[PDB]
């Protein structure tokens, strides 16, 4: 019943993930996003009924409220899967937000960064590893000031042993991946959060090529508080065991006195 149950609007974007369209549920009038994924181009499948991993992972996290975009429904077709997802309104992704406004005031980066951490914790707590945390995978609900994680298509079940496959973004990938093709979930996630935070406070990523990643030296082109630079360098420690846990990130001095999402919208987004 898919074509009667939702009403298709403009293409929101396309890339490695497939094609994603703006939509309306005709039932509720609810704004949704409609993601089409070609079966040919799915590396990794899961089960409940053989499905894309994204579907497994999203069901594991979609129980309860969160900073992750919910799987509302899904459909199989002969050559594609179709996923129905929350669409916040109005909305802008963090990539476009940063491309437009440049480097972000710390107070705002702090608010955004905290929310990302809450969301990643929530995922890990549900047994899910994202594997592609970056600006293009974070949405900002502009009215409520709430960040939501998207695109679980490179994700895995969380586990405590090493991962030897990676299908996320190279410049967000830790040096242990680049040199040895091995990493552990949590410490690789922390590396990529280090990259994210630098991107927030400088308006751009710290490392462009592999040689820079491997070397792991951070130069700041923008004025950034010494507390913030400390946290960034800590998350981008070359040795994974030298990186902080999520607990240590959230207890870090730069993370004190976070604004609530609502107060963050009033000040920085309205
Ligand atoms: Cl509104 C919304 C809801 C749920 C979404 C997505 C968007 N997207 C958005 C991707 C396109 C962006 C939009 C802005 C311009 N830059 C590119 C998405 C991408 C990949 N997997 C799941 C997704 O789920």
UniProtKB/Swiss-Prot annotation:
Enzyme Commission code(s) on record: 2.7.11.1
Tissues expressing the protein: Expressed primarily in cells of the hematopoietic and germline lineages. Isoform 1 and isoform 2 are both expressed in prostate cancer cell lines.
Assigned keywords, A-Z: Apoptosis, ATP-binding, Cell cycle, Cell membrane, Cytoplasm, Host-virus interaction, Kinase, Magnesium, Membrane, Metal-binding, Nucleotide-binding, Nucleus, Phosphoprotein, Proto-oncogene, Serine/threonine-protein kinase, Transferase, Ubl conjugation
Protein function: Proto-oncogene with serine/threonine kinase activity involved in cell survival and cell proliferation and thus providing a selective advantage in tumorigenesis. Exerts its oncogenic activity through: the regulation of MYC transcriptional activity, the regulation of cell cycle progression and by phosphorylation and inhibition of proapoptotic proteins (BAD, MAP3K5, FOXO3). Phosphorylation of MYC leads to an increase of MYC protein stability and thereby an increase of transcriptional activity.
PTM annotation: Autophosphorylated on both serine/threonine and tyrosine residues. Phosphorylated. Interaction with PPP2CA promotes dephosphorylation.
Residue(s) carrying Phosphoserine: 63, 226
Cofactor: Mg(2+)
Protein name listed in UniProt: Serine/threonine-protein kinase pim-1
GO molecular function, one term: protein serine/threonine kinase activity
Organism: Homo sapiens
Tree of life domain: Eukaryota
CDD domains given in the database record: STKc_PIM1
Signal peptide boundaries: none
Lineage: Eukaryota, Metazoa, Chordata, Craniata, Vertebrata
Annotated residues for binding of ATP: 12-20, 35, 86, 93
């Amino acid at each position: 019943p898919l074509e009667s149950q939702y009403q298709v609007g403009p293409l929101l974007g396309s890339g490695g993930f497939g094609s994603v369209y703006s939509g309306i549920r005709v039932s509720d009038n609810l704004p949704v996003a409609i993601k089409h994924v070609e079966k040919d181009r799915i590396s990794d499948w899961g089960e409940l009924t053989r499905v894309p991993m994204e579907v497994v992972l999203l069901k594991k996290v979609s129980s309860g409220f969160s900073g992750v975009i919910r799987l509302l429904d899904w459909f199989e077709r002969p050559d594609s899967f179709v996923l129905i997802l929350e669409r916040p309104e109005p909305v802008q992704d963090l990539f476009d937000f940063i491309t437009e406004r440049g480097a972000l005031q710390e107070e705002l980066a702090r608010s955004f960064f905290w929310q990302v951490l809450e969301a990643v914790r929530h995922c890990h707590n549900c047994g899910v590893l994202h594997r592609d945390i970056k600006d293009e995978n974070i949405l900002i609900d502009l009215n409520r000031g709430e960040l939501k994680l998207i695109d679980f298509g490179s994700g895995a079940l969380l586990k405590d042993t090493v991962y030897t496959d990676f299908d996320g973004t190279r410049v967000y990938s830790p040096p242990e991946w680049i040199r040895y093709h091995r990493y552990h979930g949590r410490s690789a996630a922390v590396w990529s959060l280090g990259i994210l935070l630098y991107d927030m406070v400088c308006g751009d990523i710290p490392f462009e090529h592999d040689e820079e990643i491997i070397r792991g030296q951070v130069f700041f082109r923008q004025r950034v508080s010494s507390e913030c630079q400390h946290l960034i360098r800590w998350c981008l420690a070359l040795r994974p065991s030298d990186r902080p846990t999520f607990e240590e990130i959230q207890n870090h001095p730069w993370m004190q006195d976070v604004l609530l999402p609502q107060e963050t919208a009033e000040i920085h987004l309205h």
